[PDB]
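Need the bound structure for magnesium ion, inputs here:
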Amino acid sequence: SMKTVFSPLHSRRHVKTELDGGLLIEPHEKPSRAETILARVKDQALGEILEPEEFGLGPVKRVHTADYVSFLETCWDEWVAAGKRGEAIPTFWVGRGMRARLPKDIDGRLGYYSLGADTSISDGTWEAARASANVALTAQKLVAEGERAAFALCRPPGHHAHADVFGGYCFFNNAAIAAQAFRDQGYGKVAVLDVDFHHGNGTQAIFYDRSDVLTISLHGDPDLVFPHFLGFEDETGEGDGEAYNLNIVFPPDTPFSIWSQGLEKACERIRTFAPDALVVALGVDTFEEDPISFFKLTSGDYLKLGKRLEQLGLPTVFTMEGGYDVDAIGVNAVNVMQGFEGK
Amino acid sequence: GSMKTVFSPLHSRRHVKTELDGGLLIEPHEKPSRAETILARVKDQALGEILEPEEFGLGPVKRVHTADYVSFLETCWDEWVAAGKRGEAIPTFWVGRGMRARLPKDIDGRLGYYSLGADTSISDGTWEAARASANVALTAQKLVAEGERAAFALCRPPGHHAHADVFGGYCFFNNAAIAAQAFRDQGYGKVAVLDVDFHHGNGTQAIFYDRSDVLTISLHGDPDLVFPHFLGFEDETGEGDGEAYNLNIVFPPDTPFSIWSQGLEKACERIRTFAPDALVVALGVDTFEEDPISFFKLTSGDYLKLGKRLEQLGLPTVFTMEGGYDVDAIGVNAVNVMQGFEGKS
Ligand SMILES: NCCCCCC(=O)NO
Ligand SMILES: NCCCCCC(=O)NO
Ligand SMILES: [K+]
Ligand SMILES: [K+]
Ligand SMILES: [K+]
Ligand SMILES: [K+]
Ligand SMILES: [Mg+2]
Ligand SMILES: [Mg+2]
Ligand SMILES: [Zn+2]
Ligand SMILES: [Zn+2]
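Answer from helper R.:
Posting the output first, comments after.
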């Protein structure tokens, strides 16, 4: 019914530390997320499961800068060579009133290229991010060659990464890369709808001055939650992108009965935009038991979500983003896929 | 010669257990034994009278720092604990390139808005210690304004990295900038702030960047290589009326006193043409050959030379203690600066 792209190289990203609440804890973004979703895909016989193709850095550099990609390739080696004993974590950054100037030292490069210290880098992070982008691009290729939809089971996630900024467990913006691939292959207009609990600030920034890619995100109020410094309802674009970005914000305890009204608004905006392709940055951290979020979606609500998304009648690429209740992450994500397929 | 020292026991209220460094949470370099060791050496050398600081209130602090920032520093630990966080208060997210410089409601976002680094944990007593350290600087300033040639403000925590509303690099209130601004508010026409700490005094540079009445000079390791990385380059000379009233002098690894003192001489010449009415020296002894996080190679006697050269400027002078992390020698080095100033070279 629906094909899934999955890479075993996702396990190459397996850091031990995440800065949270002043402590170094287990990262929330652990490989069992992807393994559990894959297990549910197999158990439900959703459809064919495929490994990604290697597309190289070309399609990645359509969205990210060359300096940033190079930095991501050398960062761990430079970190170890500089004598640091922990995993690679930024300690200093460009505070307000300082210069956005790229320095030489690895600590300064880490700070320049990051928006948060919650995303440790270790050996294999480069390879895993590369594989995740290739997963998204393979889903896009499946859709471009005839499939109604495809599930890019990406890990690590991507929607927080700017053209040259990483953070929030993201390195390469898989959804933005897929959308730009659609554009490069002759799709006139693309819509990116972000249903993850957090604002897709990287995707918003990448296309902020463009009208050929419409960016919509539903998320918890950034006054309250990550990413804090983007995602407010007054961010509607700039330049040619004016009115081609839409942020829809919700407060704590929001259930599906209210969240789905924002989803309906997003769907109406997409219909007037009338895109040639749709990329859905899917996060299941909207779940009522997600340990770092405050929405109250149930598991069946994801079936409803998939159904409503299918009714858009578009070629659709799903890129896996967040979701951290590992017990139910497979049921929730595959529930979106099956609801899309009519279950 | 004699020099008076201001010291507050409330510095001990600054007692964090963690510092983010190299991907690990380590024991902080900026530990209370720094101040206790300097004080012990002050006593053993009988440098002069030791006094506790006066409480000047928030007035003189708010001449330099914004009201929102001072309030934030007062409430930060309480909000952090009330929000359920289990470690010390450390920023995790900040305004990355391409995001909005907008103050949010959540304590994490406020921590990021008001910080330039995650190396400076906030815990219980940090507010009280920072207030006391600012009061140490202001009391030294009062001693100088009322007749003393010079005074040693044994500040802890240090201050020269703090902007008007940004903390980091172990700093919360910019004690040196507060002392300079107190000088200005008391009728001193022009003030010079000379930063001999190993790191760039970026907060002091920022506070006075568009002003010509306060000349800011700093000697430091190349920010291309070391903290604070994103300010301190030699092309930062001021803005507006402050153009040519900030001077950064950068040095590479392994720099000894024979080369460092050439930059110091350049700074002294700049001060000479500036001809200020008062001088504040942000003193760090992390230029020492054994300092564990810096790469200059000054000896202990070099600080005697430094103090002597500083006295030859002939100005009313306030020393504010900044960095320096080899605790074995921190007292010898700092007090060596004071005694060299008083002629014990
Ligand atoms: N460490 C704070 C969480 C960062 C973003 C996580 C996420 O799920 N984004 O979609
Ligand atoms: N954790 C990085 C070092 C920041 C403190 C620098 C200093 O001592 N300035 O005086
Ligand atoms: K979202
Ligand atoms: K756009
Ligand atoms: K300095
Ligand atoms: K100035
Ligand atoms: Mg470094
Ligand atoms: Mg928070
Ligand atoms: Zn999320
Ligand atoms: Zn220093």
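Comments: Residues 1-343 of chain A form a domain with the Arginase; Chain A fold (CATH 3.40.800.20). Residues 139 and 145 of chain A are 10 Å apart (CA to CA).
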